[PDB]
Amino acid sequence: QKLIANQFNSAIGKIQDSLSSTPSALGKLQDVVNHNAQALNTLVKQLSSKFGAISSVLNDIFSRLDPPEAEVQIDRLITGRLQSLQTYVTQQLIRAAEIRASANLAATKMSECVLGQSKRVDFCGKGYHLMSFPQSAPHGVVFLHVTYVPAQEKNFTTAPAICHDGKAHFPREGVFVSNGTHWFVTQRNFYEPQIITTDNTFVSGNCDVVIGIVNNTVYDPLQPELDS
Amino acid sequence: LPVSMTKTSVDCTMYICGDSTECSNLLLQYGSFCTQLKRALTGIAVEQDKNTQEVFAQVKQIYKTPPIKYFGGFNFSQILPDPSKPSKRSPIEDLLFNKVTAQKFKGLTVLPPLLTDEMIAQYTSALLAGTITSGWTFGAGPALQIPFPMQMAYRFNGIGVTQNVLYENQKLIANQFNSAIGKIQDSLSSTPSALGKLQDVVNHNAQALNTLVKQLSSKFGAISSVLNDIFSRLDPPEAEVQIDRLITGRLQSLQTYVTQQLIRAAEIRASANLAATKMSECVLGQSKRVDFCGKGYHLMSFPQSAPHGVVFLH
Amino acid sequence: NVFQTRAGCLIGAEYVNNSYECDIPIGAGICASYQSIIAYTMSLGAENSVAYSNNSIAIPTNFTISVTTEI
Ligand SMILES: *[C@@H]1O[C@H](CO)[C@@H](O[C@@H]2O[C@H](CO)[C@@H](O)[C@H](O)[C@H]2NC(C)=O)[C@H](O)[C@H]1NC(C)=O
Ligand SMILES: *[C@@H]1O[C@H](CO)[C@@H](O[C@@H]2O[C@H](CO)[C@@H](O)[C@H](O)[C@H]2NC(C)=O)[C@H](O)[C@H]1NC(C)=O
Ligand SMILES: *[C@@H]1O[C@H](CO)[C@@H](O[C@@H]2O[C@H](CO)[C@@H](O)[C@H](O)[C@H]2NC(C)=O)[C@H](O)[C@H]1NC(C)=O
Ligand SMILES: *[C@@H]1O[C@H](CO)[C@@H](O[C@@H]2O[C@H](CO)[C@@H](O)[C@H](O)[C@H]2NC(C)=O)[C@H](O)[C@H]1NC(C)=O
Ligand SMILES: *[C@@H]1O[C@H](CO)[C@@H](O)[C@H](O)[C@H]1NC(C)=O
Numbered sequence: 001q002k003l004i005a006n007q008f009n010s011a012i013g014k015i016q017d018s019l020s021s022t023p024s025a026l027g028k029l030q031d032v033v034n035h036n037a038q039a040l041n042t043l044v045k046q047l048s049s050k051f052g053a054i055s056s057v058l059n060d061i062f063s064r065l066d067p068p069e070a071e072v073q074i075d076r077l078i079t080g081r082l083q084s085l086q087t088y089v090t091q092q093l094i095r096a097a098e099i100r101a102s103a104n105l106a107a108t109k110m111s112e113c114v115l116g117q118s119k120r121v122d123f124c125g126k127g128y129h130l131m132s133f134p135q136s137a138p139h140g141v142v143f144l145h146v147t148y149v150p151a152q153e154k155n156f157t158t159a160p161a162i163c164h165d166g167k168a169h170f171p172r173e174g175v176f177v178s179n180g181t182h183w184f185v186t187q188r189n190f191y192e193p194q195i196i197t198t199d200n201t202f203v204s205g206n207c208d209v210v211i212g213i214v215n216n217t218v219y220d221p222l223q224p225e226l227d228s
Numbered sequence: 229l230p231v232s233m234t235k236t237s238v239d240c241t242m243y244i245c246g247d248s249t250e251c252s253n254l255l256l257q258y259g260s261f262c263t264q265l266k267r268a269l270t271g272i273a274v275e276q277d278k279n280t281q282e283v284f285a286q287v288k289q290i291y292k293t294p295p296i297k298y299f300g301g302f303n304f305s306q307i308l309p310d311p312s313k314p315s316k317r318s319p320i321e322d323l324l325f326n327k328v329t330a331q332k333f334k335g336l337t338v339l340p341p342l343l344t345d346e347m348i349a350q351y352t353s354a355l356l357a358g359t360i361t362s363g364w365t366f367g368a369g370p371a372l373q374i375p376f377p378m379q380m381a382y383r384f385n386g387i388g389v390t391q392n393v394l395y396e397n398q399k400l401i402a403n404q405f406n407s408a409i410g411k412i413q414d415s416l417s418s419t420p421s422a423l424g425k426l427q428d429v430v431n432h433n434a435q436a437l438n439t440l441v442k443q444l445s446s447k448f449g450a451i452s453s454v455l456n457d458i459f460s461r462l463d464p465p466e467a468e469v470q471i472d473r474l475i476t477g478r479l480q481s482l483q484t485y486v487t488q489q490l491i492r493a494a495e496i497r498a499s500a501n502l503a504a505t506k507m508s509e510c511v512l513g514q515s516k517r518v519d520f521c522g523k524g525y526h527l528m529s530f531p532q533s534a535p536h537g538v539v540f541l542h
Numbered sequence: 543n544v545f546q547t548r549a550g551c552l553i554g555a556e557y558v559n560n561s562y563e564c565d566i567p568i569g570a571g572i573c574a575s576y577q578s579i580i581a582y583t584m585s586l587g588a589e590n591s592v593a594y595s596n597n598s599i600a601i602p603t604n605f606t607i608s609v610t611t612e613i
Contacts, residue, residue, distance in 0.1 A: 004607055007606065007607045008607050008609075011607060011608060011609040012609055014609075015609050015611060018611075019611070025611070025613070026613060028613045029613060042260075042263070042264065045260065046259060046260070049257075049258070049259040049260070050257050050258075051258060051259060052254075052257060052258050052472050052475075052476075080259070084259075087264075087483065090487060094490055094491070094494060097494070098494065101498070109612075119516070120509055120515070121364070121367060121368070121508055121509055121512050121513035121515075122286075122367070122508040122509070122512065123508070123509070125608075125610045125612070126368070126608075126610060127368045127369060127608060128368055130607070137613070140613060141613075142611060142612070142613050143611070143612040144609055144610070144611060145609065145610045145611075145612065146607060146608075146609050147607075147608050147609075147610065148605055148606075148607060148608075149368070149369050149605065149606045149607075149608050150365075150368075150369045150370065150372075150602035150604070150605055150606075151369070151370070151602060151604045151605060151606050152602060152603045152604035153370060153372055153600045153601060153602045153603065154600065154601060154602075154603050155593075155598060155599075155600055156598070156599050156600070156601055157597060157598060157599075158375070158378070158597060158598070158599040159597065160377065160378065160381070160391075160395055161395060168392070170390075170391050170392055170395070171391075175378075175599070177599065177601065186601065188382075188601075189602065190601075190602065190603075190605075191601045191602065191603040204390075204392040204396075205392070205396065209395075209396050210395045210396065211300075211377075211395075211398060212596075212597065277567065287587070288587050288588065289587055289588055289589075289590040290586055290587050290588065290589045290590065291590055291591070291592060292589070292590075292591050294592075294594045298596075300596075339549070339569065340548055340549055340569050340570050341569070341570075342564075342567050342569055342570075342571070343571065344570060344571045346571075347571060347586055350586055351586070354587075357592075361592045361594040362592055362594075369602075371590070371592050372599075372600040372601070372602070373592050373593060373594045373595070373598060373599065373600055374599055374600075375595075375596060375597060375598075375599070378599075
């Protein structure tokens with residue numbers, strides 16, 4: 001417990017430092033504002049385009065010409081600007097659809113990784129997921145995923161089953177390993193050798209069908225009790 | 229599952245005008261559309277590479293299969309890379325490439341993808357080696373080697389079946405798996421509509437481009453469809469009106485093409501996200517979601533590359 | 543200082559037989575970086591070989607609690 005708490009505190013401090021030091025971490029949130037601002041600026045810039053007419057100023061066209069061809073010029077200007085507005089609206093609709101999809105993904109992540117523990121691989125962080133915490137951000141949400149990562153592996157020699165008195169023993173929840181001389185059964189994700197007994201193993205058939213079975217004894221807990 | 233579409237590009241003045249030059253002078257007063265088109269097409273092009281990187285580049289290590297390809301009776305020759313061929317590809321990948329298939333540069337171009345086919349094949353080979361030699365532990369930390377029959381025993385225990393069921397019937401299951409792989413190869417070889425989606429993507433892009441290049445030959449209500457003939461025929465005051473109509477029509481067509489490209493790119497991005505999720509959940513681990521990684525109780529899966537797409541063997 | 547790539551013709555950068563991570567994507571597996579300006583083929587990643595055998599296993603003996611950020 002104490003080591004886990006110390007590691008968690010160090011990890012959260014490193015997260016704060018990394019957020020404080022890396023400028024490109026929040027590019028995803030920045031890009032929305034950057035795209036919207038430049039699109040709006042381009043829309044504004046489109047207003048000062050002649051669109052093939054003599055002048056880009058409406059009242060200049062009104063004052064400097066008679067109605068007959070001034071009407072044609074204004075028709076051209078209105079059509080061009082309306083087309084630009086339609087293009088902007090279509091772009092906004094597409095961006096809104098994409099943002100809505102992203103928001104649905106974020107809602108699913110909040111409902112699954114935060115309000116509970118998820119067994120989906122890589123959905124709530126790299127490694128075995130433990131928990132997560134949400135934080136707000138300008139037009140966005142930041143998830144802090146706390147996860148478990150194995151380390152400091154060690155080699156061992158393994159066998160599928162154990163032949164004992166013509167019976168085949170298989171592990172109930174662990175796996176058989178050996179340092180070279182003795183055999184133990186240990187859990188999958190952590191090294192915790194234990195003496196092989198009849199409570200953590202189960203019997204199924206003889207030892208003439210499985211491939212790679214090895215010879216060893218299986219201690220019985222009730223044998224010493226009946227002995228005395 | 230399709231992943232990315234072809235990166236395209238257009239030259240504004242080359243298409244909108246022709247080989248003439250004062251046509252561009254007239255064009256300069258119609259606005260700044262070219263910036264919009266270049267920006268949108270560049271965004272689509274970079275999004276394609278982002279999709280490919282998200283789908284495939286999921287491991288920072290390049291694992292290699294051991295020289296001896298013996299896994300307790302299991303046969304992986306059909307999916308593992310073939311050193312004999314120069315391209316270093318699996319027979320299934322070769323069949324996929326062979327099953328999936330003019331040059332009028334009128335402003336239109338095609339930007340090559342950032343990741344070549346060999347690098348994608350190398351990613352697939354690394355993923356296969358990792359999922360064969362180390363189970364699923366390589367996807368959540370350092371790679372830990374496990375004998376393959378033991379890994380299949382863990383998977384059977386995961387699906388709710390005891391280990392003795394596997395350990396008593398290893399040879400039968402190996403034979404069934406090999407026969408299934410052979411039948412998959414034969415079915416993929418003998419089915420014309422199996423690979424429809426990627427061919428549909430290619431056909432869509434090619435047909436859209438051909439329609440764009442064909443629409444250039446329409447008069448749009450003008451006296452002639454040849455701009456140089458118009459300039460060489462009429463007094464510029466009214467040739468200006470004619471060419472104005474022509475330029476507006478061609479610009480409208482090009483805008484329509486851009487909008488269609490944007491919509492198709494969005495759909496392809498959604499498909500790429502789905503493919504990335506499938507790769508993350510069904511390959512690097514075992515999933516309990518029903519029908520998400522194949523019909524029936526899921527055991528494992530294998531990835532394979534394909535032109536603008538991926539193929540999962542569940 | 544002239545290079546011919548599948549994407550096109552490159553002027554101002556020299557090819558290097560070495561490989562690094564891609565910094566400025568150029569195309570067809572070619573990337574460019576500044577150190578003068580050099581161009582190279584991007585490296586997919588660090589190569590690793592696992593010691594697979596018929597009856598050997600590896601088991602962790604330690605763990606690490608890691609915190610990651612997602613925006
Ligand atoms: C494999 O593990 C067994 C069980 O711990 C080891 O046997 C014991 O080791 C301890 C620690 O040295 C000794 O105090 C005991 O006296 C040993 N018991 C017996 C019956 O020998 C064994 O030494 C280990 N083998 C290797 C190669 O490390
Ligand atoms: C495990 O022990 C059994 C019994 O002690 C061994 O089986 C005997 O093996 C010898 C040598 O091949 C034969 O002559 C006997 O007929 C076998 N007896 C039975 C009942 O099968 C077995 O070989 C041992 N296995 C290992 C790997 O040492
Ligand atoms: C694994 O399967 C492959 C084919 O799926 C086997 O390769 C065949 O081997 C036989 C005899 O050597 C040849 O007649 C066939 O032409 C081969 N098939 C192909 C497609 O090349 C292979 O023998 C099997 N076993 C191993 C260990 O690879
Ligand atoms: C498991 O790993 C942790 C660190 O990853 C080890 O804790 C460190 O142990 C060394 C040596 O005793 C100390 O100098 C460090 O200060 C410890 N780190 C912290 C954060 O306290 C731990 O000892 C390892 N466990 C085993 C059984 O080796
Ligand atoms: C031990 O491994 C070798 C190759 O590494 C293999 O040929 C042999 O069949 C394995 N032994 C058993 C009992 O499977």
